[PDB]
Design a protein around this ligand. Structure first.
Ligand SMILES: Nc1ncnc2c1ncn2[C@@H]1O[C@H](COP(=O)(O)OP(=O)(O)OP(=O)(O)O)[C@@H](O)[C@H]1O
Ligand SMILES: Nc1ncnc2c1ncn2[C@@H]1O[C@H](COP(=O)(O)OP(=O)(O)OP(=O)(O)O)[C@@H](O)[C@H]1O
Ligand SMILES: [Mg+2]
Ligand SMILES: [Mg+2]
Lengths: 505, 505
């Protein structure tokens, strides 16, 4: 009976106590000091659970379901855990009062039914042209991150990037993130942030004698070395003769003009590689009038291949007119204090790039995280097409609607249902609390202003501190994330109740 | 802070825990062992708090307001204590939820207001002709007592017994219960209990050769001795002449033949007294044809006085036409092994007696107790005129209506009103508990079956375990006694919250 089941509940309740203080943007920050002295300040639900040395099986079963998803978004995760641990919490008081755990699982199951269908008969249809909407949903992702600069810049780009790549897949829109490169440089400002309609190779040209801008450049993506490897790389030479030395390294020098000539046999305007380009081979490309780039990321040859229509080639005796790329005009421009080659006017319109700049050496990294999550989120908004008002709105409803339902559902099973409703309202209470107001007072002030039907989207505006329409202040969010959180948590929750006993090894 | 308020509350719950298993029908009996080891097995609420020493003021103060009654009939006291302690209990669970007692008091007042008037606007007009109603009110009283042989007999009697005494005073019915005398003899059948239209004197006639019964007979309620008192009683004799001796004790005896002729100077037909009658004066009263009784008790000379219209005569030389009494028939009868005078058909209609018979030496005494609570109660219903459905019915309604009310009334105040409601259902849960069914199950089955107004007088059957109509199974109860309980209980409960700190001399 009561015995081991408490210890389990208790473990769950502890894990809740590790995230409680960090929910929403008035959330506090947890310090994590790494063993080699290195410091990390965070409020990320995952890390705080992932880096935690748990020894309690309950807690490990609960966080595997809570923390992780087999989805691109990393969001709803603090909700998933908080909501898990409150549902378990509120359930404990029913067992104190002697209700069978079997009932409370069925009760939470009937509540889970309704709660879920209550999101569905209420989301609003959002599709591609609802661009004046996606700008807001995006700020709702970026606003709790560290970005100090204007969010409007970043919101505007994120929208165009998703809409650029969107393509009908079975007569409904789909987007793949892989057609978008994200390049970042510290210093400068966020006003220098932009979308390039091309690909950007962050290695400059071989000599400035090469054209500054080339018209209709037939690109050559060469994975193979355009430089010598050293015959002494494995072990020391066995040549004792400088006459033999000469004729060998000459024939090796004539081998790189061969490699060059075997690619210029196809008549490319531009030649880019991921390894060196010899000092005889740089002079040789310069006298032919080609634009060459030396030692670029294997990462970017790839990014230019499926953009310009080209293929990355690892063998000169294999490059053909079929393998070259097409781009209308390739040029080299200066980004901050580094020159970089840009290859605009490529054959794929889905393929684009983003230049993030501004802020410190770690803040620019977290601006790239924020823009990555915002970009994913907006594309998920297109992939699904439902978006609801945040700030507690759909939540309060799932409670009130459930509370009216409860009377009719059954005997003991009532108390259970009524419990699921109260636990959700506990979430909005924790939220109000960390925001800086009295919970019972603000919740009541909302459940009177949320009794009539026309106040459907009413929540509590965190800074104003009083019940208003969240939708009409931009606070809108993905209806499916905040729906699978209810499924993740209620699973985890009910699983804690499912363990009768433990006999271990 | 926490200092006295935990302690006060604590003590109040403890007292509750002493009566809880003794509430209502089927309840368990508590054993009271005096300091001389004298044993009393009981279930009387009062005694159990009266004979017990409480070390806490707060407790002592709660039980005083609950237990106490300034009306002649006392009922509802186990209820008074429980509802009190359950209201204190549910308020502590509010202090936990972080509400101040100034809000719990305001909450409770608003719930108490509504609770009261909900008993007004539901009660039914029961007046003198509603005798089939008073029959119910008698049985609702006698039915949960230890004694139970022939209660229908005693039920019927109560109704007749009171209906006779009820008189219009201030343009509404009053019952002056003091005009009913209650006499008890042990042994014989319990069915032979009866109502007598007169007074009953427990003493026999002085000479059997005196009449068996006189029609339209003038009573002489004589207090003065018709027996001599000898001089050795005061002090040692000082008379040395025996002739004088003789004349003292001769004239003192001739003084009683003097008194007897000076009483019969008013034209008496029967004479009952407080002291004895001299043997010469017995033979004298016998030869006159008088009907005499000797050595009664003064307590009934007065009751038989103002029943037959006489006065109790202290001074024989003051006896007159205005001092004597009229009765339709006085006679001498035998009840079991006891020979007594009966005085049926008195001048005053109100003055009647009840004759208890049957059982053993301790049972017949508990038949007198039961009869008083039953008489009282029916007469209290005549004195008021409002009567409601018993068995939990009015209780569940004062709960339900408050629960539906709460949403609309305010913030914190909601929680108090709701709690107050939860305390009233608690009362019936205890009641249900002691019959042996599951509280939550049967409680829920009421809260679903009791929405329709055709089930207003629904309650819970404690011998068949299922919600039924109480009214139509004869469980009706006095509407003001279960209302004044509420005023006590709410007062008392709020009185315990009202104490902040305490100083001891
Ligand atoms: N101005 C605001 N007023 C009220 N509520 C707000 C406001 N801005 C944000 N919110 C709410 O705060 C909630 C909490 O967000 P958060 O993203 O921290 O929860 P989470 O998704 O569980 O955590 P994570 O995103 O790290 O997984 C949002 O879902 C949103 O509805
Ligand atoms: N036959 C019955 N069926 C249902 N309930 C009954 C029956 N007889 C009495 N009751 C209920 O029992 C309840 C409480 O009983 P009880 O009289 O012991 O408590 P109390 O009146 O608070 O204590 P006390 O009478 O000693 O002051 C009453 O309100 C009455 O409705
Ligand atoms: Mg989130
Ligand atoms: Mg009673």
């Amino acid at each position: 009976g009561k015995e081991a089941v408490r210890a389990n509940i208790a473990a769950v309740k502890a894990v809740e106590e590790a995230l409680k203080s960090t929910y929403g943007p008035r959330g506090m920050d947890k310090m994590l000091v790494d063993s080699l002295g290195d410091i990390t300040i965070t409020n990320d639900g995952a890390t705080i659970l992932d880096k935690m040395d748990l020894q309690h099986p309950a807690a490990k079963l609960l966080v595997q379901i809570a923390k992780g998803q087999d989805e691109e978004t990393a969001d709803g995760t603090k909700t998933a855990v908080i909501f898990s641990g409150e549902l378990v919490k509120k359930a404990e008081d029913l067992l104190y009062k002697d209700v069978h755990p079997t009932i409370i699982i069925s009760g939470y199951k009937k509540a889970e039914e309704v709660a879920l269908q209550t999101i569905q008969e209420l989301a609003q249809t959002v599709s591609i042209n609802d661009t004046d909407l996606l700008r807001k949903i995006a700020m709702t992702s970026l606003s709790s991150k560290a970005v100090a600069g204007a969010r409007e810049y970043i919101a505007d780009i994120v929208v165009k990037a998703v809409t650029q790549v969107a393509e009908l897949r079975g007569d409904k829109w789909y987007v793949d993130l892989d057609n978008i490169q994200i390049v970042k440089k510290a210093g400068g400002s966020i006003n220098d942030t932009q979308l390039v309609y091309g690909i950007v190779v962050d290695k400059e040209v071989v000599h400035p004698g090469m054209p500054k801008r080339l018209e209709n450049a037939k690109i050559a993506l060469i994975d193979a070395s355009l430089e010598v490897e050293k015959p002494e790389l494995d072990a020391e030479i066995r040549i004792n003769d400088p006459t033999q030395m000469q004729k060998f390294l000459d024939e090796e020098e004539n081998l790189i003009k061969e490699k060059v000539d075997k690619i210029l046999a196809t008549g490319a305007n531009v030649i880019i590689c991921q390894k060196g380009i010899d000092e005889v081979a740089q002079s040789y490309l310069a006298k032919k009038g080609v634009l060459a780039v030396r030692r670029a990321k294997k990462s970017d040859l790839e990014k230019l291949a499926r953009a310009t229509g080209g293929r990355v080639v690892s063998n000169i005796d294999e490059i053909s007119e079929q393998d070259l790329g097409y781009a209308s005009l390739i040029e080299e421009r200066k980004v901050g204090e580094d020159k970089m080659v840009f290859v605009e006017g490529a054959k794929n319109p889905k393929s684009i790039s983003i230049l993030i700049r501004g802020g410190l050496e770690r803040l620019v990294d977290e601006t790239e995280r924020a823009l990555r999550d915002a970009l994913g989120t907006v594309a998920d908004v297109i992939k699904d097409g439902r978006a609801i008002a945040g700030g507690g709105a759909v939540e309060i409803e799932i409670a009130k609607k459930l509370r009216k339902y409860a009377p009719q559902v059954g005997g003991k099973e009532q108390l259970a249902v009524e419990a699921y409703a109260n636990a959700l309202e506990s979430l909005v209470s924790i939220l109000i609390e960390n925001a800086g107001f009295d919970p019972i007072d603000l919740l009541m002030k909302l459940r009177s202003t949320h009794e009539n039907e026309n106040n459907k989207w009413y929540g509590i505006d965190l800074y104003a501190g009083q019940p208003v329409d969240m939708w009409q202040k931009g606070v809108i969010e993905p209806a499916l994330v905040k729906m699978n959180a209810i499924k993740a948590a209620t699973e985890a929750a009910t699983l804690v109740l499912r363990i009768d006993d433990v006999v271990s090894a």
